[PDB]
């Protein structure tokens, strides 16, 4: 009894530096009484959740946020590399209330205008969030879809309890034909999982486009405390970072340089990407009576696995989900937490 991705294709190249733009709909549709508080406020909630999720897991990417109201679409965040701007924007939104209906075309076009200064290595994806049953366009739709996917921008949309095959067709266009991006839901657990997978870099079978280098340098922490002075907010900065060549002071941020305009991280972010470079073979649940390994966990120490024949119960799940390339165990919580947080296969890292 398993519902598992049979082939976890990940050993290649996914979209890393993603210029992500969630779009929001704040219309009378988001009011309606089908979700527990509402669609609307719950969406604000899970959107904040995604802000943290994304900027954690994609801590080298950028973001701007746009909402839609009253047959009009409204940006709420300039392209920002500080999460809290998005966070407090979302706060300022939640208290504002939805009205009217989404002018989908205007949102698409605003986004189109936004992601233009993004270079090649910076990749372009928008993120619809939809709960309405209709749009309001002022401009020819498939016209703008043509422009969009002609400028190489796949989009992931998350509609609510319906289907709108224009969304599927537009996505299939944006996603080079192949479609998986019109994920809509039927439950709130379902909703958050949708988010969590929206976080990860997204490959399908990549169009072999330009692989361009990216150049940068690294700043250095400061020593003097009283010497408070800033050039990125022009405020007091009691100690921080120092552009490798431009040698300006920068308050703590992974941002691009504000003087000679070059990117500045340390190394950690590369390491997160590597954790998204070679994920591991899935821990296979060892065959029930043919496993007969040592009776505990390896990664943790979990002596439970069976009761040795209780006719039904023990003969159920001889749960020893152990790795593939290392074949070294790890209990169910160990499998979940390894594959979840620290993929870090020690048994496979061990040798």
């Amino acid at each position: 009894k398993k519902r598992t991705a049979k082939k976890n294709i990940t050993p290649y190249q996914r979209g890393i530096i993603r210029s992500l733009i969630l779009t929001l709909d704040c219309s009378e549709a988001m009011l309606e009484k089908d979700l527990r508080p509402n669609r609307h406020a719950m969406i604000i909630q899970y959107a904040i959740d995604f802000v943290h999720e994304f900027f954690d897991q994609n801590p080298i990417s950028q973001m701007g946020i746009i909402i839609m109201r009253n047959g009009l679409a409204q940006l709420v965040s300039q392209v920002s590399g500080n999460p809290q701007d998005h966070i407090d924007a979302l706060k300022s939104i939640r208290k504002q209330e939805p009205k009217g209906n989404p002018s989908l075309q205007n949102a698409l076009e605003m986004a189109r205008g936004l992601l233009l200064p993004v270079p090649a290595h910076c990749t372009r994806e928008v993120l619809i969030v939809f709960g309405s049953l209709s749009t309001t366009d002022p401009g020819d739709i498939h016209q703008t879809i043509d422009s969009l996917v002609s400028e190489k921008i796949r989009v992931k949309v998350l509609g609510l309890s319906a289907q709108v095959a224009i969304c599927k067709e537009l996505c299939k266009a944006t996603n080079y034909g192949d479609e998986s991006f019109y994920k809509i839901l039927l439950d709130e657990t379902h909703l958050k999982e949708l988010f969590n997978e929206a976080v990860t870099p997204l490959p399908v079978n990549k169009i072999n486009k330009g692989f361009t280098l990216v150049k940068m340098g690294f700043p250095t922490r400061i020593f003097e405390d009283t010497p408070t002075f800033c050039s990125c907010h022009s405020k007091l900065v009691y100690g921080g970072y120092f552009c490798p060549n431009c040698h300006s002071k920068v308050c703590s941020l992974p941002t691009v340089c504000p003087c000679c305009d070059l990117m500045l991280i340390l190394s950690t972010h590369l390491a997160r990407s590597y954790h998204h470079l070679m994920p591991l073979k899935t821990f296979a649940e060892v065959p029930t009576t043919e496993k007969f390994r040592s009776e505990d966990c390896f990664s943790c120490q979990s002596r439970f696995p069976x009761x040795x024949x209780x006719x039904x119960x023990x003969x159920x799940x001889x749960s020893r989900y152990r790795c593939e390339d290392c074949k070294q165990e790890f209990c169910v919580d160990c499998d979940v937490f390894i594959h979840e947080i620290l993929h870090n296969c020690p048994g496979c890292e061990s040798k």
């Binding site: 049953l133 209709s134 498939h142 289907q163 709108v164 039927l186």
Partner: protein, 754 residues
Amino acid sequence: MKFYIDDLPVLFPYPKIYPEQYNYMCDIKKTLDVGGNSILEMPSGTGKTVSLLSLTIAYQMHYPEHRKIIYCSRTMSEIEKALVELENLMDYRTKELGYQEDFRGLGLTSRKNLCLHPEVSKERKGTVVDEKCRRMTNGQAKRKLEEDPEANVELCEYHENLYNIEVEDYLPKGVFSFEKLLKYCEEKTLCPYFIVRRMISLCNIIIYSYHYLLDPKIAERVSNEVSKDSIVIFDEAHNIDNVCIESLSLDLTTDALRRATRGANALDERISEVRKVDSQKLQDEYEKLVQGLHSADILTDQEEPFVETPVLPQDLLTEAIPGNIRRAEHFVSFLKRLIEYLKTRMKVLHVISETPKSFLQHLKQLTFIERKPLRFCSERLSLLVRTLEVTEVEDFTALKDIATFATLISTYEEGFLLIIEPYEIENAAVPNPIMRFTCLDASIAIKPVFERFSSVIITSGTISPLDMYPRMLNFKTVLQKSYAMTLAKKSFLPMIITKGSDQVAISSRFEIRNDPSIVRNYGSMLVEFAKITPDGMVVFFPSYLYMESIVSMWQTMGILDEVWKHKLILVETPDAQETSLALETYRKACSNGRGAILLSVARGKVSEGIDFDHQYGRTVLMIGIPFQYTESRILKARLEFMRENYRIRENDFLSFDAMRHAAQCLGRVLRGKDDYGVMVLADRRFSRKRSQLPKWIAQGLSDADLNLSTDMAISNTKQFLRTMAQPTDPKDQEGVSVWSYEDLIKHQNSRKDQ
């Protein structure tokens, strides 16, 4: 695929199949080997088109006996969908096998949809288009044009290039569908009408409307080659008896009688002028009557024959002179006998129905004019018109209609019924008398086509019961099976909304007008869908006039406003063109973002020929039930003959045909097994007749779906579409109910030979 039914390779153009399809092919072949009729059910949710065409090509190419196949759709649109479908079948067949095709199979509808001449094309009424392509390319036009070169005569020149290149040979190889046929013919600036008309003697399959096989005035030019040993299918033949009794129908009204006075006086004028100028050729035609029916130029007419044949295909005919009518002036005399005897029969104070013979003997007492000469009305008229090489027909449309009338009434008896209502009560107490007349037995009209052909195939996406038709049309069949939709997933929720919000038992059969209880009931139902439903939703109504009263008083309600906030309304309208423009705009909108709604009559014209994909079709609603005795008693006497002839009483057939139209409109929403949506009915009566709903449809009806409230139904569709958007595709449960390529068919069936 290239598989077998134990005897024939099958080049199925899809690697995939459905088990029901193999059931279909097996039983249909088992028929064809013993040519018969064998009424069946094939769900339209699967496109039986491909099953049909694939097996038919396999059978025709494989067995060397029947090189010709007849596939009768209902309309031109069904034909062209099948045309591109067969084109795909043929392209796949060539792709798999190389080139074994040598295949030419074409359809045909009319100049109205095929007159490649632009000036003629700009006209709108198909009768004038017919006459105008006649005159423009007439066996007479060419002559007087050629002996006398003048700008008086013209031609499409499409007939010219036809004559030049086409009528020695055929099209290159293609199955030129209306798209491909019209494109190719335009690139060759050809007359596709005459092209197919001449081509008839060579196509390996043929397709056309039911009418071309049903209206003997057009179902006349059938050759034995196209007839003798062809194989004949009917698809969506459910609503056929309508066409039968229509083909044998003739109503009247006396404004046309004034038009016919105009025409017949004009004929006095023409006979006067010609006979004074020259009666000699008229005497030539007198001796041509004296030699008989004059098939020498009454049937030997490559373009001449003026009046087509209302009678069955020349079976109910003789050949003698019409006695005294040899004189065309006697002829016009009896023409007036008719027209104005019709006029004196036109203004009875009340309704009167007539058997042809009863009123016929009546007329003889009133005016001792005789039946056998009377039949020759149409043919004599046509011949005299040709001998007058006339320049106009509009004055004589009434004359050809009356020719048809007299011919049938002098011809047909004891199955038909004249009826004379002195007004339309719909606008009662005004003069609108109607001398309507029609048949009552469809089996009669069908009988010649059954008589010619054994291997006849009937299949509609509605048929139930499979016995009603054998009763009505009195025919032998063998394998009368309905195919329950084998699906391991729901994919459709039909539900009977007997209870509204107020749980009021609902129907439109209360009346054709308003009763704000049911009115707001239905408005609430509608608008609640309007919110919850996504793009693509059409509900169907019992009657345009009823729907009209309801819609007007609903515009009076704000009930339009919320749907106007969400979706797009499209309404039905009597004008064919603007109805169609609404249709295409609906389609574009629903495929686009803004959801669009149509609403319509179960009898409505679109419900005849237009199918619905996932996009355009999500939630259909049968408000009330499509009954008709709102309208006239022609159906009353129809039922009278029914009962005294068939063991079927009124209510039985009223229910039967109402549910026929119901399922007829239902079937559209589904395209392929990735198809789904809502199906709702809104009336109390649908519980009693749960069993009259076709097999798969009834399977989708669990008794727990009966007489639901509308709010619970709202919930039902809520969860329903929540599910439907989801990719529950194990594809390991799809093998058994899709029979994956070349294997589960091979595996199961070659094992299933048990």
